[PDB]
């Protein structure tokens, strides 16, 4: 059973990175929503 | 806050009311007076600690309001007021007699 | 002590600061080995280094 | 009219209160057990009512 999740830090960092979020304008809005909510972990 | 270490006080409340002892220390709102409000203490001997341990008799902190300063001349509890001199030095003054002491 | 630090002129403050750095290194070594009897000396020494650095900075500025 | 001295004297007292004739409330009149009132104030109550 190759299960749904299979971790790879390189792909995880590229897909959910802080820099990737900053690159797109919309992702900055997601980061701002995390900050407004007060979540400690903004990004993986 | 008016009361300070090193001056005699009289306790007018509690089991030890009517007993006069010197104030060992004050923290913020609690005061400790030698020979007043003694409480039994149980100490567990520890070889690391220097103290021998065992049953000890020691002072217990009590609320500041209960204790009152004792005026020497009249030997009665008296309230404390502050009087400002021309020189500007500040000293505690007994309310009853305007006594300069304490 | 702050007046004593203030009175002296900059060039000798620099040398005094270097001496203080050496003393702090020795104090750290003695603390690490446990030779140092009393732990207040290290704190007071750190405060002294901070005071010296501030005085040097003010004198250099003006 | 209400003078400052009479107000300062009255306010501290537990159940003594002072009010001007114009600014009078039924809850106060009913509540407080006794009422002290001047003839001139009474005349102005007549004119008001």
């Amino acid at each position: 059973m190759k299960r749904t999740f299979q971790p790879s830090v390189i792909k995880r960092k590229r897909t959910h990175g802080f820099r990737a979020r900053m690159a797109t304008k919309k992702g900055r809005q997601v980061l701002a929503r995390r900050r407004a909510k007060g979540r400690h972990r903004l990004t993986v | 806050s008016k009361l300070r270490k090193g001056d005699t006080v009289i306790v007018i409340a509690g089991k030890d009311k009517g007993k006069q002892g010197t104030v060992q220390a004050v923290k913020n709102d609690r005061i400790k007076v030698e020979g007043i409000n003694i409480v039994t203490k149980h100490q567990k001997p520890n070889q690391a600690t220097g103290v021998e341990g065992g049953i000890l008799k020691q002072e217990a902190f009590l609320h500041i309001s209960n204790v009152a300063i004792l005026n020497a001349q009249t030997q009665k509890a008296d309230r404390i007021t502050y009087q400002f001199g021309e020189d500007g030095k500040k000293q505690r003054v007994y309310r009853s007699n305007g006594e300069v002491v304490a | 002590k702050i007046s004593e630090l203030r009175d002296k002129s900059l060039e000798e403050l620099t040398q005094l600061l270097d001496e203080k750095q050496l003393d702090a290194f020795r104090i750290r070594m003695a603390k690490a080995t446990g030779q140092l009897g009393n732990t207040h000396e290290v704190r007071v020494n750190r405060r002294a280094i901070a005071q010296l650095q501030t005085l040097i900075n003010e004198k250099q500025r003006g | 009219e209400v003078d400052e001295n009479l107000y300062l004297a009255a306010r501290n007292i537990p159940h003594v209160n002072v009010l001007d004739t114009s600014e009078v409330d039924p809850v106060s009149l009913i509540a407080f057990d006794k009422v002290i009132m001047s003839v001139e104030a009474a005349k102005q109550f007549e004119e008001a009512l």
């Binding site: - | - | - | 009219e1 209400v2 003078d3 400052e4 107000y7 009255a10 306010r11 209160n17 002072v18 009010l19 001007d20 600014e23 409330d25 106060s28």
Partner: protein
Amino acid sequence: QNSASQRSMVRTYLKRVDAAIAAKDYDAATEAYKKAIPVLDRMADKGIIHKNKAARRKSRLNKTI
């Protein structure tokens, strides 16, 4: 009730100031107005009377004086 009495006390002083204005005497108006000022400032803190209203009354009285 207490607040009502606090309000009541001021009105008499203001009426006296109005009578002083009618007299047109400088010192009589000045003493009454200076007597009133602090009480109005104090009542302003309680919130019974608007601070803007108190400032407007002070400006009007100063202009009248």
